[PDB]
Amino acid sequence: ASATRFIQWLRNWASGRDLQAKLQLRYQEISKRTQPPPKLPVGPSHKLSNNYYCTRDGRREAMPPSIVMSSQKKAVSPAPPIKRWELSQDEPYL
Amino acid sequence: EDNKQFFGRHRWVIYTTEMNGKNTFWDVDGSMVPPEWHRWLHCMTDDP
Amino acid sequence: GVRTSPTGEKVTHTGQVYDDGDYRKVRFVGRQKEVNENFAIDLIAEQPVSQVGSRVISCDGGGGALGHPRVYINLDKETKTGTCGYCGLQFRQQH
Amino acid sequence: LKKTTGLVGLAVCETPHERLKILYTKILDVLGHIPKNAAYRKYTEQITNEKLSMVKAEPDVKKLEERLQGGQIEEVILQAENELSLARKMIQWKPWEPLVEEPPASQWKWPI
Amino acid sequence: RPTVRPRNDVAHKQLSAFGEYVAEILPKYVQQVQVSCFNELEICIHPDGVIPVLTFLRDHSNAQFKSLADLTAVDIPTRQNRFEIVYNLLSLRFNSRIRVKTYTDELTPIESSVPVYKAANWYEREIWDMFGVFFANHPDLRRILTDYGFEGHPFRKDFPLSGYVELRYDDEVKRVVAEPVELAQEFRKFDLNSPWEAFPAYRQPP
Amino acid sequence: TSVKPIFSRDMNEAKRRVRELYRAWYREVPNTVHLFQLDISVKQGRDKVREMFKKNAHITDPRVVDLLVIKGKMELEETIKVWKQRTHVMRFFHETEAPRPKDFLSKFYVGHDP
Amino acid sequence: TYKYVNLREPSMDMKSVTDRAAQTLLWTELIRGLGMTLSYLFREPATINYPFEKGPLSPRFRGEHALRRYPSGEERCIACKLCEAVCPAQAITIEAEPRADGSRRTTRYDIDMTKCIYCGFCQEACPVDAIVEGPNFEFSTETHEELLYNKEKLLNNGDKWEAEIAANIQADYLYR
Amino acid sequence: QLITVDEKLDITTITGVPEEHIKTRKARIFVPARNNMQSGVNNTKKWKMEFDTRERWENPLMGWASTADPLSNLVLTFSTKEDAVAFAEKNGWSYDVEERKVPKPKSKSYGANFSWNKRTRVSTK
Amino acid sequence: SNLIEVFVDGQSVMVEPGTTVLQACEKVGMQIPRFCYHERLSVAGNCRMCLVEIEKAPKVVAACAMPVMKGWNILTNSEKTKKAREGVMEFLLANHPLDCPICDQGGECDLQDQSMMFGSDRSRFLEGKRAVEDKNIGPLVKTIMTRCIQCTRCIRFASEIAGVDDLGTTGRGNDMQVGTYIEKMFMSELSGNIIDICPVGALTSKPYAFTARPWETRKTESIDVMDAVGSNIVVSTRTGEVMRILPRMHEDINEEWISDKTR
Amino acid sequence: NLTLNFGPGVLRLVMELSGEMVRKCDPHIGLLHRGTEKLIEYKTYLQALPYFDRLDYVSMMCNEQAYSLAVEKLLNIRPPPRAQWIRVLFGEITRLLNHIMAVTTHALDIGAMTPFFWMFEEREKMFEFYERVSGARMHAAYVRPGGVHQDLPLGLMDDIYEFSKNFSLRIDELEEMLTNNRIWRNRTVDIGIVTAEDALNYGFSGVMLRGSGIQWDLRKTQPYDVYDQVEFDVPIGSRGDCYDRYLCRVEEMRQSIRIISQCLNKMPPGEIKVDDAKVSPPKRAEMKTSMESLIHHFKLYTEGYQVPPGATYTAIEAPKGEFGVYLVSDGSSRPYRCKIKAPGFAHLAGLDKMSKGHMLADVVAIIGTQDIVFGEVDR
Ligand SMILES: CCCCCCCCCCCCCCCCCC(=O)OC[C@H](COP(=O)(O)OCCN)OC(=O)CCCCCCCCCCCCCCCCC
Ligand code: SF4
Ligand code: SF4
Ligand code: SF4
Ligand code: SF4
Ligand code: FES
Ligand SMILES: [K+]
Ligand SMILES: [Zn+2]
């Protein structure tokens, strides 16, 4: 950021870019190293009522595998065939 | 400090030439920085 | 409370010190035995007993969420103080 | 006619309709050597016949690719070759026969 | 419900239908088909069916599992056939995954699946190295991860964590030597299991 | 009690593979000593090969014999192709191990192990 | 959605073919690359002047361990062994017994700093903020033995660094 | 095609275990006793195999507990004692089997606390 | 022939008349949560952790005490049963002290473990907690009576097993306290067993205090040689040192008890 | 044919050469095998998490995500939306970290050394983002089952925005050095051609597939966290060579910036770990006042949470390809088995196939194009 006008012009010309607008060295734009204290929010289970654990217990809703066939009609695929991808409209080609 | 330098070079220390009876004119160590200044020098805080 | 043994070695706050015939103290020759001089047992014994006007008092160790889990201490016995199990601070009921 | 399939090692096919008609016909030929009640024959004949009807109904390659939903027509040709190769292997394996052996009783029990 | 993983019945039904589809087509080899509560389809097969079942899944037009994601083993010493061999396959055409499992013991060889997937070459070498399962007709079966001359199969449940030998440089012989393992600090085994049951849904009959 | 074999149907064919492996190991020892510049003799190397073979002389299962030959052939390939280094070949001889006591009294003096 | 990174046809007019011939024979795109390194030569470097200048760190930084006290000087650690239990590397070893005043305190608290993975799980698990990873990262030693910390070393680290440790905790404890 | 093998299953020679840790070790096959500190019984379901305890000594430097026993931490889990015994036999380990201890059914009656004429009458609640 | 048919979650079991609901459930491998119930002590029915729904019965029954009737379907995992456990656990923890890090029970605590498995995962208790005076009952058993959950296991053990009526409850309601009332030592050859049966850290071994955590100990099942009874024991060791002695159940010898000398 | 035992991550290559032509390539690995998978069986689920930082030790947080997703699937819980947005944000920062390492060390290996220095100052700035959220520059252990460990410090997103605003210019400078350089193209174009069918059968994934025209990206076809809520393009090659895979990786760096820009704007409020204290530890203030909280904190950090029994294969689109874990739970608080699927394992297994008919110096390029870290290959 302290480079002379000539040196700024020289390196801009050699690179073909406006290097001064996107310097890779950080100056004052960074955020201050001392910040005000946070006050973080709480989750949906922070309630005083209507909040029994048995109604929100994910682990106890897990089940053993469903056995569809044990040793003791239209054809099907594991899922529908995947759909063709669409070419990008942002920039289809490099 | 010089806030016109880029982040990282905007703070520095010039070590004392003697610390706890050890000649440190040429032998400087990063561990000579005491804890209260350590926080400031490493930018863990803004206030010295 | 750093005391030193007859052989000159400092006794730690845990009571450790190599005895006379212990070869292991050779490790300190030409070097030093690192000992912390601030015995927490002697430091907590310096704090005064806090006089309170309730049968039950709570201690979180000070500093709110920066202390220890908050515990409630019964002060019914009058022949001793109530001691916090976490930080060692003492309490006594007034009158 | 497209310049490329976009997949390395997969060449464009100039005559996809004829190529697919030949492969599907070959598949139904090999499937005739499989017992009539084998599930593999019944299912493979059904899906092969469905693809064959599309090929006979749609002269346009791009619309055929849309009906088949198997990617580029060159990908569909390759899958037909894979099915034909598989069908010949099924004749040797005869997987429609009963289970060779039951596992030990606790073989598939988890947790132990 | 914000903290509970949502179910997907459409995928569960699709995978159940395809599981039956496979069982009907290869009854010679399929022993069990199950779909887990998070929608993963497992086909358990007799080990004779490795090549036929994998070939069908790779090549059948209604399957097209062209990618072997992974191949590994699990050691379960309480079983008569202690080693469970697991194949995880991916179908790009149908955007689906499937798991094929079979079994073997210390002395029974499994047919190498390199003919079906070239990916299997190194995976089967690792299984041989770590579990000692031999794969028949492998193009080049040998250790891959352990040191040369290493004795034993480390990933077996009865192989000790720190092994039997350790290395150091010995100045007298001017080379690295192997010696029986001694540890300055023994690894501290922890007994962590709670004596109270956590999951009633998985309780086993007494 | 009917099992799928590895390579051999019975002990007779297993023993044939064992002998072929021994011949390959026996003939390889002179090259190994020279290639790795070992400080043992060819007799010492061939004695070790016999010692390694003899410790398994009690096996009556052709499947166990088959795996032993498979592992022995793997061990030979590593040596012949110089995937092993001097340290790997010389590990068979344990020249930094002090001989552990054998009799009851010697073991009694040093510690508690059997 | 996808894009092609390299699906293009060079033009085959004379002006385009002559453009590519000149690039081949006059090395124009090589000369262009020379321009970019030339531009960097005249940029200010990113190097900082260590040890007189230090790379920036945050209050969460996980450095050398220390054992902390209450303001009274009493040890915070009450030998609960949660840190030992959680330690992924089994780098912590603890023994405890009733102190002469009945207090629940450790008689051994070792951290093998060559087993430690500096993961911070011990300071998460501690219910009393007793064990922390401090801000110091400049404690390399000349011998392996110097990195086997016992309770005396760790208490001395706490007394040495508490001024900075407490300030860092003050900045981050509302995020915990 | 299959073959007939009439031999006892022995894999000691292909496991890589040193000989000293096969012949000299004594495996213990047992169902763990309930930890008397707690009432839960979920840790008494499976069979466990562990090996004989061997020397631990103090590390001169730190006082840590050192060992030279590679199997000091090896504990295996089995659904039945038969599975545990089968695993022990093929690995060459001599073993002791301890039969499962099960609490015997008890006869409990809240009403006996108030017996008219029996000693089961409780003096407090 | 004497057996009656009941159902545990719809699965039939044949039990002897007089079998409690809690015992019917353990015939199908289901362990009902409990605190006051101990199978070797008289039934108390005060903790209420064993409450369980009977199908088509509006009121939850105490499984430890209620005899099972023919044809009952016990719903050990219904919403009513789960809500009953959550509420009782919430009441148990309302006044309990935040002591786990300094409490010897931590890591082998039934209050911790059943709170993890059967209770809620948070607190809505916004008041101050009860705090209780400690009692001195000898050199062997340390008392931290703020941890007591008033299960009366120690009282029943002392009275029935040790035949010593020195333990009782004094006061009433939330102020009810377990102890001796007067300054008295509970010195009996079986006294150390109240440490094991106390579900919480209210009664702990004084010699064992603070030395180890349960997860780090290695259990060696062994035999006692202090007398000729041959009590079955577990020797807890850590890093090559004996830390404590625990009873090992043996129905035909020591049941689940040991003497103070053995312990 | 001449035989050579090259090499002393660390790689040993045994190559058979015929003049200048590689006749065979035999990679000998395991020089960094550290029994991670066995060690994990002695750890609780939380204790095993830091092992995943040290697999592909250039993509630390992506590895954490794959493991956490697998555990959450077995647990039947889900992380809160803000945790999911943080995980996608840092997953794409991690992709930039990896891709910078891949391209520049690929270039450094073949003599183009300067771009390494330019872009590693960019890596150093992203190491700061890692340190500010977790206190560690690389092995953050920040993404955990149930969410993330802590919320972002105030002011971090502002600095990520400032970093991102200028980064595409850094990519442009890297392209000026390599993309049109005839020496770079001579070293990369038509080197290591892999066909679409060979790529699938050999088990390739990621750019090793897309370089050959296969339209596959797990972030699109099998999305996880909030990847279905962001917009981006998948780069696709046409020739399946080293040059096209170089272009794919450079373009993927640009698409990562595009995603990062969306994560910054759409970051929602709320908690950052599942509000279920039987899985995720309670806040420290709760742990020190509420009895239930203290119990659950105590048990989570000693026993750990128990995971319902079952087995899952979970995969993500990691920067090096498909990274998955086959995680088996026996119902306890420690995993029974954890097989790590590392994409570089199958890629390196294809080196012999890919190097056929090439010269010795091409093998260096082909190893670079595969993006090989032996932390994950050897595990
Ligand atoms: C009136 C009638 C007059 C008659 C005479 C007219 C003649 C004028 C017209 C002819 C001009 C010819 C110019 C001669 C220069 C050499 C040309 C050349 O060979 O360049 C091509 C060479 C190979 O080209 P390549 O793309 O790799 O492959 C092509 C094969 N299919 O590629 C290369 O060699 C590239 C070089 C590789 C090394 C790169 C490092 C150098 C880059 C910096 C160069 C700086 C400039 C040098 C200045 C020196 C000053 C002393
Ligand atoms: S930082 Fe991690 S590895 Fe190091 S002592 Fe703490 S918990 Fe153990
Ligand atoms: S440092 Fe903290 S977690 Fe570790 S034993 Fe002490 S109080 Fe417990
Ligand atoms: S009795 Fe159990 S719940 Fe209560 S403080 Fe002790 S360990 Fe914690
Ligand atoms: S001291 Fe223990 S056993 Fe006695 S009533 Fe209280 S909790 Fe129950
Ligand atoms: S166990 Fe039934 S009320 Fe206590
Ligand atoms: K107790
Ligand atoms: Zn306090």
UniProtKB/Swiss-Prot annotation, chain C:
Alphabetical keyword list: Electron transport, Membrane, Mitochondrion, Mitochondrion inner membrane, Respiratory chain, Transit peptide, Transport
Membrane topology type: Peripheral membrane protein
Keyword Membrane belongs to the record: yes
Subcellular location per the Swiss-Prot or TrEMBL entry: Mitochondrion inner membrane
Any one of the GO CC terms: mitochondrial inner membrane
A GO biological process held by the record: mitochondrial electron transport, NADH to ubiquinone
UniProt entry tagged with the keyword Membrane: yes
Subunit and partners: Mammalian complex I is composed of 45 different subunits. This is a component of the iron-sulfur (IP) fragment of the enzyme.
Function: Accessory subunit of the mitochondrial membrane respiratory chain NADH dehydrogenase (Complex I), that is believed not to be involved in catalysis. Complex I functions in the transfer of electrons from NADH to the respiratory chain. The immediate electron acceptor for the enzyme is believed to be ubiquinone.
Family: Belongs to the complex I NDUFS6 subunit family.
Record-given protein name: NADH dehydrogenase [ubiquinone] iron-sulfur protein 6, mitochondrial
Organism: Bos taurus
Full-protein interval shown: 29 to 123 of 124
UniProtKB/Swiss-Prot annotation, chain F:
Positions of disulphide bridges: none
Keyword annotations from UniProtKB, A to Z: Acetylation, Electron transport, Membrane, Mitochondrion, Mitochondrion inner membrane, Respiratory chain, Transport
InterPro entries, A to Z: Complex1_LYR_NDUFA6_LYRM6 (IPR045299), NADH_Ub_cplx-1_asu_su-6 (IPR016488)
CDD domains: Complex1_LYR_NDUFA6_LYRM6
Subcellular location(s) of the protein: Mitochondrion inner membrane
GO BP, sorted A to Z: mitochondrial respiratory chain complex I assembly
GO cellular component assignments: mitochondrial inner membrane; mitochondrion; respiratory chain complex I
Membrane topology classification: Peripheral membrane protein
Claim: Transport is one of the keywords in the record: yes
Pfam families tied to this protein: Complex1_LYR_2 (PF13233)
Subunit (UniProt): Mammalian complex I is composed of 45 different subunits.
Annotated family: Belongs to the complex I LYR family.
Function (record text): Accessory subunit of the mitochondrial membrane respiratory chain NADH dehydrogenase (Complex I), that is believed to be not involved in catalysis. Required for proper complex I assembly. Complex I functions in the transfer of electrons from NADH to the respiratory chain. The immediate electron acceptor for the enzyme is believed to be ubiquinone.
Descriptive protein name: NADH dehydrogenase [ubiquinone] 1 alpha subcomplex subunit 6
Protein's gene: NDUFA6
UniProtKB/Swiss-Prot annotation, chain H:
Chief location: mitochondrion
The protein, known as: NADH dehydrogenase [ubiquinone] iron-sulfur protein 4, mitochondrial
Highest taxon above the source species: Eukaryota
Positions of post-translational Phosphoserine modification: S123
Homology family: Belongs to the complex I NDUFS4 subunit family.
Function statement: Accessory subunit of the mitochondrial membrane respiratory chain NADH dehydrogenase (Complex I), that is believed not to be involved in catalysis. Complex I functions in the transfer of electrons from NADH to the respiratory chain. The immediate electron acceptor for the enzyme is believed to be ubiquinone.
Region of the whole protein represented: 51 to 175 of 175
UniProt keyword annotations, A-Z: Electron transport, Membrane, Mitochondrion, Mitochondrion inner membrane, Phosphoprotein, Respiratory chain, Transit peptide, Transport
Gene Ontology cellular component terms for the protein in this record: mitochondrial inner membrane; mitochondrion; respiratory chain complex I
Annotated region (Disordered), positions in chain: 99-125
PTM annotation: Phosphorylated.
Native source organism of the sequence: Bos taurus (Bovine)
Membrane topology: Peripheral membrane protein
Subcellular location: Mitochondrion inner membrane
GO MF entries: NADH dehydrogenase (ubiquinone) activity
Biological process annotations from GO: brain development; electron transport chain; mitochondrial respiratory chain complex I assembly; reactive oxygen species metabolic process; response to cAMP
Description of how the protein assembles with itself and partners: Mammalian complex I is composed of 45 different subunits. This is a component of the iron-sulfur (IP) fragment of the enzyme. Interacts with BCAP31 and TOMM40; the interaction mediates its translocation to the mitochondria; the interaction with BCAP31 is direct.
UniProtKB/Swiss-Prot annotation, chain I:
Binding site for [2Fe-2S] cluster: C36, C47, C50, C64
Domain 4Fe-4S His(Cys)3-ligated-type: 80-119
Domain 2Fe-2S ferredoxin-type: 2-80
Residues carrying N6-acetyllysine: K56
Entry's localization field: Mitochondrion inner membrane
Positions of the 4Fe-4S Mo/W bis-MGD-type domain: 217-263
Binding site for [4Fe-4S] cluster 1: H96, C100, C103, C109
Highest taxon of source: Eukaryota
Subunit: Core subunit of respiratory chain NADH dehydrogenase (Complex I) which is composed of 45 different subunits. This is the largest subunit of complex I and it is a component of the iron-sulfur (IP) fragment of the enzyme. Complex I associates with ubiquinol-cytochrome reductase complex (Complex III) to form supercomplexes. Interacts with MDM2 and AKAP1.
Family: Belongs to the complex I 75 kDa subunit family.
Function of the molecule: Core subunit of the mitochondrial membrane respiratory chain NADH dehydrogenase (Complex I) which catalyzes electron transfer from NADH through the respiratory chain, using ubiquinone as an electron acceptor. Essential for catalysing the entry and efficient transfer of electrons within complex I. Plays a key role in the assembly and stability of complex I and participates in the association of complex I with ubiquinol-cytochrome reductase complex (Complex III) to form supercomplexes.
Descriptive protein name: NADH-ubiquinone oxidoreductase 75 kDa subunit, mitochondrial
From-to range in the entire protein, with total length: 29 to 291 of 727
